[model samples]
Target: FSPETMKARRAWTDVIQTLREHKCQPRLLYPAKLSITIDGETKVFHDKTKFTQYLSTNPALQRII
Candidate 1:
């Protein structure tokens, strides 16, 4: 059941995994917000667009997409 839900979660997992590979710490929030920390500074991303905006500044992980 909930194949769609599982897919959604998998997508989230992919993002988290990518961040981890880039030496980031990503915490999963309820309802699926991304709380990530890099270089000891933390940031909570409410949407993919916002996350993409932030990523451009720190492009080390941008090579993924």
Candidate 2:
């Protein structure tokens, strides 16, 4: 897998684990999209290549799953 793909995978794994911890079911709504919500704001991502960098650097967003 490409580095971005790998990072995307890892971030998704973390998001899934976080959802499980909250007693929520996690599903991939889109192969190349990620949606997150935090502090009453929602953000949707359409590029898997940029997701890992965004998630890794931001401490304010939560994956809604």
Candidate 3:
């Protein structure tokens, strides 16, 4: 009965969807991790803080906020 978890998961999937639409490479990791390749540049974030701010805007709007 905890939709909070559901929302959190949705946030992940939403980012995935957006990334796919942009034709970018997105590698989703469980618990907390996202690996992405941009313009042939590879990056991986294995922590919360900045990563949260990232996908937070992602759900707020597509492209940019």
Candidate 4:
């Protein structure tokens, strides 16, 4: 994957992980999109709510915090 995709994947991984930790399973009510940027790197996920980037060997991180 490109660095940009990797950045977004990593950021969202944290986000999803946090959500799961709180016992909150993020439910995608509808299609959604998000842009994650960190340290000047940027990535976009179209239909993020529907299909998010997850760890290759594990589930998506649940939350951000």
* Overall lDDT per candidate, in order of appearance: 0.69, 0.57, 0.58, 0.44
Which has the higher TM-score value, candidate number 1 or candidate number 2? 1
lDDT by residue (tens digit), candidate 4, 1-47:
56655554555555655555544453322133444433355444544
Give per-residue CA lDDT, model 1, range 1-65, as digits (tens).
25654544455677977777756677777565778776787887656667778878867668753
lDDT for model 4, please: 0.44
User: Each prediction's TM-score against the native?
Assistant: 0.66, 0.41, 0.51, 0.34
Q: Could you tell me the lDDT of residue 14 within candidate 2? A: 68
Model 2 regions lying over 4 Å from their true place: 1-14, 19-27, 59-65
- Every candidate's CA RMSD: 3.4, 5.3, 5.1, 11.3
TM-score of 4: 0.34
Residue 16 shift from truth in candidate 1, angstroms: 1.4
Residue 65, model 3, lDDT: 21
Residue 14 displacement in candidate 3 (angstroms): 1.6
lDDT (C-alpha) at residue 11 in model 4? 51
| Clash count, one per candidate | 0, 0, 0, 14
Best by TM-score: 1
Candidate 3 vs candidate 4: the lDDT winner is 3
